[model samples]
Target: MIEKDVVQILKAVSEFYPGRFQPDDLKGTVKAWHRVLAEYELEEIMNNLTDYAKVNKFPPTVSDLLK
Candidate 1:
């Protein structure tokens, strides 16, 4: 996965839920998400993220977004 793409996804999450979705360990967040989402395709990840965004008010886990 593109690091830029992952950052884009995370940035949106942060923007949408600024108070609740704090990535306190941002480097670790990005590092972990990269590996967690590694098996997924670019289009799939974005599609899943958008779909998750539409339905959920709370922040998502990797499982929530992808599984």
Candidate 2:
């Protein structure tokens, strides 16, 4: 579920910058996100991504999601 949501958020961000959302590029980031957000369900992450995409111009950072 985390993988799918990560891909989904990446895909959404791909619109802003193509060829910049490769999963491999974020391996460590994904692990970090998983560690920090382990308690939150994928649904919550998806919601955060959705909200993030609305106001953010760049792809989200962990700090962005925290906001």
Candidate 3:
């Protein structure tokens, strides 16, 4: 099972990048980041997301941290 932490990330990513988290074919790069995260299980991507959040100067959403 993917870690809860990771699923929380997908949840955040879902909201952060909608097409990636869910599904959207209209936009190109809109889904690019989502596809990157989609390849890995939730747990697999958590650390990457954490590092990404840190580097991006954007805090995780309330739901992302608490989820």
Candidate 4:
């Protein structure tokens, strides 16, 4: 088995410096950190993290979730 941590490690490595959830361009080092983890694959990774092996019952669309 590859192990879950390894997957997380891969995600961490594959993941960009600043995650998409935040606004990395702004905020600078003082304020809250930010990174555009807006990659389409993030959802798949997130889904894997959750319990059960089903797609989100109807998670918000990536477009709607965008900043």
Error of 2 at 33 (Å): 1.7
Off by over 4 Å in 4: 17-67
Task: In angstroms, give how far residue 20 of model 1 lies from its true place.
Answer: 1.3
1-67: candidate 3 lDDT, tens digit per residue: 2244344554665665544345345244334444444445555456555655655544444334322
- Go through the candidates in order and give each one's C-alpha lDDT: 0.78, 0.62, 0.47, 0.34
Lowest summed lDDT window (length 10), candidate 4: 29-38
Candidate 4 accuracy as lDDT: 0.34
Angstrom error at residue 15, model 1: 2.3
lDDT of 4 by residue, 1-67 (tens): 1233233423442243334323244224212111333233545545543422133333232233233
Worst 10 residues of 1 by lDDT: 38-47
Candidate 3: residue 67 Cα off by (Å): 22
Worst lDDT run of 10 residues, candidate 3, spans 58-67
lDDT of 4 at 52: 24
List CA RMSD, all candidates: 1.6, 3.2, 8.9, 12.0
Model 2 C-alpha lDDT per residue in residues 1-67, reported as the tens digit of each score:
4555655555565665566555565666566666656555666666777787777556766567654
CA displacement after TM-score superposition, residue 48 of candidate 2 (Å) = 1.3
Better of 2 and 4 by TM-score: 2
> Which prediction has the highest lDDT against the true structure?
1
Worst 10-residue lDDT window, candidate 2: 1-10
The CA lDDT at 65 in model 2 is 64
**Candidate 1 regions off by >4 Å?**
none
